[PDB]
Symmetry: D2
Subunit: 222 residues, 4 copies
């Protein structure tokens, strides 16, 4: 049936125990938040930012979507981004992908004629896919999957650094770091894919694509 009681009971029991252990647990954040992190990751049920990073409420503001995609043209994601950088002044942006990611697999195998919105949505994976024909072809179904997940992370990290929000934030001395990481559903573990990026100079050193040229294109002409 559709009854919520065992869900709510489970909630109750959880909140009961947290306040028991630390009394200000909830009350400190009853009227405000001051998270340090923004996390962008996949909507996937195996990937709970707070749980995997063992965080308590108030620590990590979270955008989650299918494929952990970041696009200037997505107001959903860009809103979580604007708000946390400009208003909450967070310090760290975690861009998190995960092995076994359906959106990455779908991005690899589907035929664009596939119907529905998920397929509209994952067009960004296809774009990353297309730029890396060389890292992907003649790899096993499984290695391709893993590679695709990582390339996506790296592409999304780029997108975050190139976002007008992060770029305006850098232009005004606000400390903002951006981090490419990956999670393994089968192990609970997080490895760092790209070392911390804290401004242009870092991105120049750490990102395959050229952010400087992206930012200053006309400097590349006559």
């Amino acid at each position: 049936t559709a009854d919520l009681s065992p869900l709510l009971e489970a909630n109750r029991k959880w909140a009961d125990e947290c306040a028991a252990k630390d009394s200000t647990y909830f009350s400190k954040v009853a009227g405000s938040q001051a998270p340090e992190y923004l996390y962008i990751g996949c909507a996937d049920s195996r990937v709970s930012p707070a749980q995997l990073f063992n965080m308590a409420p108030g620590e990590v503001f979270v955008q989650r979507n299918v494929g952990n995609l970041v696009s200037n043209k997505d107001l959903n994601c860009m809103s979580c981004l604007e708000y946390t950088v400009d208003h909450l002044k967070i310090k760290h942006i975690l861009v998190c992908g995960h092995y076994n990611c359906g959106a990455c697999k779908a991005g690899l195998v589907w035929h664009p004629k596939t119907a529905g919105v998920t397929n509209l949505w994952i067009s960004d994976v296809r774009e990353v896919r297309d730029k890396n024909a060389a890292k992907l072809h003649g790899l096993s179904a499984d290695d391709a999957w893993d590679k695709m997940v990582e390339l996506n992370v790296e592409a999304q990290v780029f997108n975050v650094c190139a976002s007008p929000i992060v770029q305006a934030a850098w232009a005004r001395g606000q400390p903002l770091s951006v981090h490419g990481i990956v999670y393994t559903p089968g192990t609970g573990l997080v490895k760092e894919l790209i070392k911390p990026i804290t401004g242009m100079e870092d991105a120049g050193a750490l990102l395959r694509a050229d952010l400087k040229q992206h930012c200053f294109f006309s400097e590349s002409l006559a």
Copy 2:
């Protein structure tokens, strides 16, 4: 400072501890997921569904965005909805507001001219607000804010119920329930705000706006 091992270490501990409490915790999801719930909640750092419902991985699919908004025209949220209803066949949609929600307050206070993407993104909140002008007219700041949060949850439940994905699932005799819940950051407590909605009938009984009339409007033309 932006190092990340601290965190990375906290992840390790967590994953070992869980692997200690249970040997097949992570391993049983290495290569699939069968969650029963899709959750749509605020990206607010205080409100981590898997945590607050004491769920383990593989249990809840999560869309999180600024103001827990659901729109047919937002491909971000729509693809979480399609992929869970259609590929994953989840049984329960949780639509969760939370008190002290900045998006809800911003929808009461900002002038539409404010700049930025957040302001654009929370246009839906203003629309819920304009539609309920009278319920809100008169109340104190604090009261209005709380009322907005609640009207918003109800409006977002309605929008999930009215979405193409859900109507199509209902017309296909898919078992699928939709829940209006709110959460009190200052307490860790979730309260059911709207009883379970499992189809048109439930919704005709339970919602302040007319789903039937939304779904069959032309039947009432001459």
Copy 3:
């Protein structure tokens, strides 16, 4: 066949004759534009702004979409809007709907379970539809159609006036007028539906919905 030659020939013959009649016809706008109008109307093949208003190149900048819809959350439309108000400094915004509009009919009759993107897209028509149960019910299929087209015009005019672009433009003394009009495919004719709106005071007088309250909501509380 797919050959363009009769299309290009037709173009050629057209450009030939225009330059023949007036030599600066094209050349004056070869390197720039200074249009006075922005037109927002339907993608419908019977509704060619320049032709119906007998305009020459450089006069009217044009957004056209299915249903002539205006939404803060649509970057396509909002871009045409931002650009012409902020950069080109246009004076007049024409919001134009048209009888026999499919998007309006579809908005009336379809069941939201309908598949595809057009149905996602016209959700705004349904929203206007829902607010006007009273002006529409027990009207003939045809009168309902016509009414729905007009209500949409009026709703879109509101949306344009409430847009952050138009609102910021008003706040800085920039003269900007907004106009609700309608076109008849079967007659070539344009009637004015709403008299010119040139700022708040006008909208207050000319729009059914309350723009002032929309702009200053908190002034409606305690």
Copy 4:
């Protein structure tokens, strides 16, 4: 001054004159349309397709936006595409750039941090640009600009060809052609920039990016 009769009068004259040249000009479309073309062009005031192609009403369905961009994820343009391909069964998609396009220049010159929605919207242009960095590296301002316009038209042709709506039409043996055209505001002249594309074959022959590989990428995995 914002009166509107002037215009309204020009509309009258036009409509009488056309009704003079032909008695059933408007009347034959009063209650239907069967255009053969969908046109996707810049919202630029200088570029009115029905006018420049000397088409009468009922002949061209029109999407117009800032930079003639086509994205699977833009429901605005996508619904023009779906409704024309699927309901109307048009035969020819015209994808039209134009020289002296501000969006194309903005995609060369702006810094991603610029503010506003336009800048967000033209992210696609920057992506076409980054992908062709080398073709553009070195050229004069004037030359680059022209080159951007042309790379953009080709990229947008590719995106129409790769869209779900078109691939699905092609796989259904629908006759459907896609054309890359550019237009010179200073002359009234359209030039064919890419020969007609009527299916995969055409596109494999005619496009600089690999449609086949985009459509069947996984076939090249081990």
